[PDB]
């Protein structure tokens, strides 16, 4: 149905090589863009939008997303998600949680690579 | 495919003549205990624990759900989502979020329906 490939981290990213662990018989078509695979979430960073550590967050696989929304971003292959900020050269990564602080990347310092759009989550 | 039933409220239970709406394509075999049904929610009232307006709800029908569970249940015909704590006859309906206030219910001076157990959610 819809593939699992590994985690993502609502906090500070962490490594992570993704593979299928499992599939659940869901309409990819229920979220907008579809879903193309899930990642179960660990951490508290996004816990103010509604997504807890244990959740199964839904991406739609791109590359371009703008400013606000809310992504899948690998660093030196250590993944995260959160609401995305690109200015210039600078990428600020913005948590949903007060007791967290964003993440900078800068582009011409480190290479930077979008995974994937946020578009639903899931918890059972 | 789950069904779509209508409305509950995470805040003041709201009047609600439940009927098939739609239906989702999601196994109810993803949660445990099976869900028979999807909600639509309103309100803010179980934020702390990710449910946010707007989310979908599963739902396992059941009418024995037992204390600290999170349950749909209905009173004067009107329906709400919230923590459960039953003593004697006298049911209390406790939120996720300091904003709000609990819900007491005297089961002498009432009827009140247990529709069944909050199993799971799906945000789209």
Redesign the interface.
């Known amino acids: 149905?819809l593939p699992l490939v590994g985690r993502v981290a609502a906090g500070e990213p962490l490594p992570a090589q993704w593979h299928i662990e499992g599939h659940?018989?869901?309409?990819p078509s229920?979220?907008?863009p579809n879903a193309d695979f899930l990642l179960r979430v660990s951490g508290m960073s996004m816990?103010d939008?509604?997504?807890?550590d244990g959740?199964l967050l839904?991406v739609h696989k791109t590359q371009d997303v703008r400013n606000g929304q809310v992504v899948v971003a690998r660093i030196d292959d250590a993944v995260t998600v959160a609401r995305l900020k690109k200015q210039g050269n600078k990428v600020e990564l913005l948590p949903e949680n007060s007791e967290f602080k964003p993440i900078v990347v800068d582009l011409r310092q480190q290479s930077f690579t979008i995974e994937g759009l946020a578009?639903?989550?899931?918890?059972?």
């Open positions: 149905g659940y018989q869901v309409d229920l979220f907008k816990k939008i509604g997504i807890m959740d839904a578009v639903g989550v899931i918890r059972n």
